[PDB]
Amino acid sequence: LKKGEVSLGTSIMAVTFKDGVILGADSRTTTGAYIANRVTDKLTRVHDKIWCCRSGSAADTQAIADIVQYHLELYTSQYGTPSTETAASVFKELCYENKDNLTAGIIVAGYDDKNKGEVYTIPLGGSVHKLPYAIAGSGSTFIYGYCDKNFRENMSKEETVDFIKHSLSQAIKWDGSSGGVIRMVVLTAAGVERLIFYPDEYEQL
Amino acid sequence: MTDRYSFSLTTFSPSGKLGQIDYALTAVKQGVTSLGIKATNGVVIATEKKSSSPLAMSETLSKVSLLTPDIGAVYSGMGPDYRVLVDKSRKVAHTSYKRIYGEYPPTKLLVSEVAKIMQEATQSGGVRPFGVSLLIAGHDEFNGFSLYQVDPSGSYFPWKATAIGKGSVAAKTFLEKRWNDELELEDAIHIALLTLKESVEGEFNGDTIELAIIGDENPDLLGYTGIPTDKGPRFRKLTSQEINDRLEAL
Amino acid sequence: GTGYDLSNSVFSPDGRNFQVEYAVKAVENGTTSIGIKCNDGVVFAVEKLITSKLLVPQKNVKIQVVDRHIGCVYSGLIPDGRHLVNRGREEAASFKKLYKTPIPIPAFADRLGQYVQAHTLYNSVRPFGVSTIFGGVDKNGAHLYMLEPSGSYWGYKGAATGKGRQSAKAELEKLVDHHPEGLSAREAVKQAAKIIYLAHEDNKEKDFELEISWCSLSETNGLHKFVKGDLLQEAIDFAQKEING
Amino acid sequence: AQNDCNSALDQLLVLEKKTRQASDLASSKEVLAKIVDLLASRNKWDDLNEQLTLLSKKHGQLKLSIQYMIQKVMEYLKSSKSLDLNTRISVIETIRVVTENKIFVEVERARVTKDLVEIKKE
Amino acid sequence: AGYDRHITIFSPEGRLYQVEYAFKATNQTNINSLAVRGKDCTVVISQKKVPDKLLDPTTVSYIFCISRTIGMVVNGPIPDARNAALRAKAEAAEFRYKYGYDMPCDVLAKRMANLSQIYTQRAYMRPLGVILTFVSVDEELGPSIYKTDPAGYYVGYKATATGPKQQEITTNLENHFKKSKIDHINEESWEKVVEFAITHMIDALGTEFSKNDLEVGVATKDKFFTLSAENIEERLVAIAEQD
């Protein structure tokens, strides 16, 4: 029995654009009402071109993710590079057999060069669902209308970069367990590009 | 699969011999010169670390291992046998004295553990002993400075000064005279260098010789650069530069 | 009688134990199977020997599926082949449940492969002694692999084995060389039949029954199927044409 | 002059490209002989020596042919004499097909050397 | 000697039949490999033996990618090479899972060295005849070459060569490293190091090599990559058009 419990920024997303997927997050851990972390890395590589957003309980998500990391390292070396769908199943299996202790809201989003960019969203209790884009956490219902209407496939990188910065910066404002940095992860075949913007920046922009 | 060799692979005869052991004792002799001196003013160990190919580096080869921060070991024989037995020796030292009794092990009691593993791999069928002999040197307030040999037999004994590997008989002899009860650590480093000089020439330089001491130490690496709780561990192993410098003044 | 012929709890002076060497020799006096890689698929064919009129036509089959899109045929010792496949199934299913996808052929190959290697490092556990021609199509193409006794495997573009190997390999390389890799899957069926028919010339003191299958990306739509009906009659026609008839 | 220069460059580049270290069409021994006499008339004796050394390190067309181009060249310097005798020393020490074994019919090697010795003796 | 093939006993010789023959049989595939380190790169070039036209020329491999940084060349029979490859791949991932840090060369060497020693100690498993050349540009150890040999002995090398023509290759590496007075290549750009390597290899083995006769694996700081057919050609092309 875990004494106390932990929570994350609960507005997470993977958005498809011109050449892949751009993955976006807010990060913030709190333990009650103590701000355990301003910044966090919850922008998690599970393979070199396949990253994820972790949401739900900090203790639990991190513990799962590490196990997923071990399987997908071993998986690469032996059976060839994963897919987004391959990563997603492994995450799900671990949640489902141990949904008696686990609370993990996962978006796994990765880039493949024959599927293009792929978003697989695994809610609580665990089920694999393929969608062309995702929003998750509990703050996602409130941006459902925005996201659906302005979601467009094959949008310019500059335009997607604005769209994610804006999407979250609105979400974070109206929702209360959201906060800290907005970090973003661009996945194309040229590699992995890392964006961090601090509070004072994104609010304004 | 298992269960095909459950007879021991040492057996007796009326000469009482244990096949495996006699063969393995021979292996120790064919190692490189390693020695131990207790100077009763510390303990000094030296051995040769040597190339086996022209593009093999020797600064990726050590024969001196730390077993615990303040017990060190040296050997002659089979390289592999020494590393695997060393892992198991490390295991018991750490789990069973530093958690149970909260402190570093007493040498003689660690000598009992390492012996018991070797004697065990002979008593149990399907496997052989280790084909090495180790010299386990340590220091404690309670026991002073100490030195033991543990054989491939899983027998042990203490030895004021000893040598094993190639040129064993002569190395021990010259040493016995040069060994005093009350002996200065600098002179005891020279005697070791001097001995290894008699075993090898034409490849004998100080940066291929690896020497470690029990006595002087560096507090600044034991996290006592600041105010100490205590002085801490007495083993500190020399670098090559220190060894070469003394070789000039040999 | 050296313990390099009665035990594999040691390394040999020839780098292999005699009994594994012997497995390789017993594949070759055996039955002929081939495998034809093509630009969109793979085709399998095996010679089924007829010794009596007491046998039934195609109610004994040698090509057995693993999954639904990987086809396995093997030549050599019958019991060893059942056991290899039973294993092959347990891996394949574990993969489908666990990652939610049909298994890749280089992946599937590493899993059987590691198991053939295991039974070759113990002094009392029998080696395998079948050579398995296997393959299928996945999401980056078609692949033909061949697995040996010793745990040896590589990717092939043409493969042949058995009694009639020499003949088979001769026709097979000519045709593969002539073609970009093997041309269409459809063309390859007939060709495949000629090789097996041609190999049968090396053993006319028995009859054969030609058995073909295929697994092709757009010419079976990702599945492994048996080759039958019209498609089997046509390959027969082509075969009896060249080898006179 | 202008003639020697066009002819020399053209036959040289093409010989190297075809022959290579492995044939593509190659060039016959005749092609390289032509190139040699062209370059001796074209430019100075020290430049000829240097350019010949540099080619021969590739592999030549065979080591024997290289010895044949030396043998010609030596005779020509000895016709002209004076400072041209000084250059004779120069060909010999630089090219190792005539100062070291590279092949085992090296009769042309001993012969070139005796020509140099005779002059030295003077 | 002893009689190591019938019972697991020692020899008075110190070295057993299983160890002695593992030293021998490591070449029958007609293979030669070398590894050199650059200033800030590590290059492996290895012979590639595609002996038939029944086989695809790029499924035949002998260089395995064990980790994302670490490469391993196995010099040995192919079942033994894959047996070692499978174990090495798990240990590399397991070490990252538990200890939170990817595998370096020396720790993989150690794990396998201990395993090989145990199977020689056992009477219930055979040891393998594999020489494992582990290579990387480690974060703390710099450019690295650590080579293991069968016995369970391993040690770190400047540079190394493997194959029956080990000796021929050695004299060329020695000559360079003395001349330059350092035990690594002065060059620092993995292209020029690859090109240099091939030069000394042609010279030693006495045949000019094609792309399908070579297979190249390159290590750099934080990445390992294999060079393809076109990639190998680009290097080869220069060596054919200079003297």
GROMACS .gro file of C-alpha atoms in nm, chain B residues 126-208:
model
   83
  331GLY     CA    1   3.008  -3.235  -1.226
  332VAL     CA    2   3.241  -2.940  -1.176
  333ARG     CA    3   3.613  -2.883  -1.109
  334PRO     CA    4   3.809  -2.657  -0.861
  335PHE     CA    5   3.958  -2.320  -0.954
  336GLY     CA    6   4.315  -2.349  -1.085
  337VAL     CA    7   4.459  -2.046  -0.892
  338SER     CA    8   4.603  -1.965  -0.557
  339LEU     CA    9   4.523  -1.631  -0.410
  340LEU     CA   10   4.710  -1.423  -0.154
  341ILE     CA   11   4.456  -1.220   0.051
  342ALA     CA   12   4.618  -0.932   0.238
  343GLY     CA   13   4.420  -0.714   0.475
  344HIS     CA   14   4.449  -0.493   0.783
  345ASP     CA   15   4.226  -0.452   1.088
  346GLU     CA   16   4.295  -0.290   1.429
  347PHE     CA   17   4.211  -0.624   1.597
  348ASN     CA   18   4.443  -0.850   1.401
  349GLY     CA   19   4.710  -0.609   1.284
  350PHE     CA   20   4.846  -0.658   0.944
  351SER     CA   21   4.796  -1.005   0.795
  352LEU     CA   22   4.866  -1.210   0.484
  353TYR     CA   23   4.727  -1.562   0.395
  354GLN     CA   24   4.750  -1.788   0.087
  355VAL     CA   25   4.446  -1.992  -0.008
  356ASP     CA   26   4.542  -2.289  -0.235
  357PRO     CA   27   4.345  -2.449  -0.515
  358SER     CA   28   4.292  -2.725  -0.263
  359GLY     CA   29   4.077  -2.501  -0.049
  360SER     CA   30   4.353  -2.543   0.219
  361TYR     CA   31   4.490  -2.234   0.375
  362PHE     CA   32   4.788  -2.114   0.558
  363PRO     CA   33   4.946  -1.779   0.669
  364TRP     CA   34   5.282  -1.681   0.531
  365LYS     CA   35   5.514  -1.405   0.655
  366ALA     CA   36   5.635  -1.361   0.287
  367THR     CA   37   5.576  -1.584  -0.010
  368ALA     CA   38   5.576  -1.589  -0.387
  369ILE     CA   39   5.393  -1.786  -0.642
  370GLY     CA   40   5.419  -1.825  -1.018
  371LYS     CA   41   5.732  -1.862  -1.217
  372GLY     CA   42   6.063  -1.838  -1.023
  373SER     CA   43   5.888  -1.931  -0.692
  374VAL     CA   44   6.167  -2.104  -0.504
  375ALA     CA   45   6.444  -1.849  -0.565
  376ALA     CA   46   6.214  -1.542  -0.517
  377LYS     CA   47   6.097  -1.655  -0.174
  378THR     CA   48   6.460  -1.734  -0.068
  379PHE     CA   49   6.634  -1.401  -0.149
  380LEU     CA   50   6.334  -1.236   0.016
  381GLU     CA   51   6.357  -1.418   0.345
  382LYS     CA   52   6.703  -1.261   0.425
  383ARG     CA   53   6.597  -0.916   0.294
  384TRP     CA   54   6.273  -0.949   0.509
  385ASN     CA   55   6.323  -0.808   0.859
  386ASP     CA   56   6.067  -0.807   1.140
  387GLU     CA   57   6.089  -0.425   1.137
  388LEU     CA   58   6.111  -0.320   0.772
  389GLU     CA   59   6.050   0.025   0.611
  390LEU     CA   60   5.778   0.036   0.344
  391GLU     CA   61   6.004   0.215   0.080
  392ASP     CA   62   6.278  -0.061   0.121
  393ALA     CA   63   5.999  -0.326   0.088
  394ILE     CA   64   5.883  -0.169  -0.240
  395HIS     CA   65   6.245  -0.187  -0.371
  396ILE     CA   66   6.289  -0.556  -0.275
  397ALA     CA   67   5.967  -0.647  -0.476
  398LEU     CA   68   6.088  -0.451  -0.779
  399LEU     CA   69   6.427  -0.619  -0.748
  400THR     CA   70   6.280  -0.968  -0.743
  401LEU     CA   71   6.061  -0.905  -1.055
  402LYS     CA   72   6.375  -0.762  -1.222
  403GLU     CA   73   6.539  -1.101  -1.167
  404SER     CA   74   6.242  -1.287  -1.335
  405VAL     CA   75   6.217  -1.069  -1.644
  406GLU     CA   76   6.433  -0.839  -1.851
  407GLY     CA   77   6.396  -0.686  -2.196
  408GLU     CA   78   6.035  -0.585  -2.128
  409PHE     CA   79   6.088  -0.475  -1.760
  410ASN     CA   80   6.002  -0.108  -1.728
  411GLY     CA   81   5.803   0.048  -1.439
  412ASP     CA   82   5.489   0.111  -1.633
  413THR     CA   83   5.422  -0.262  -1.685
   0.00000   0.00000   0.00000
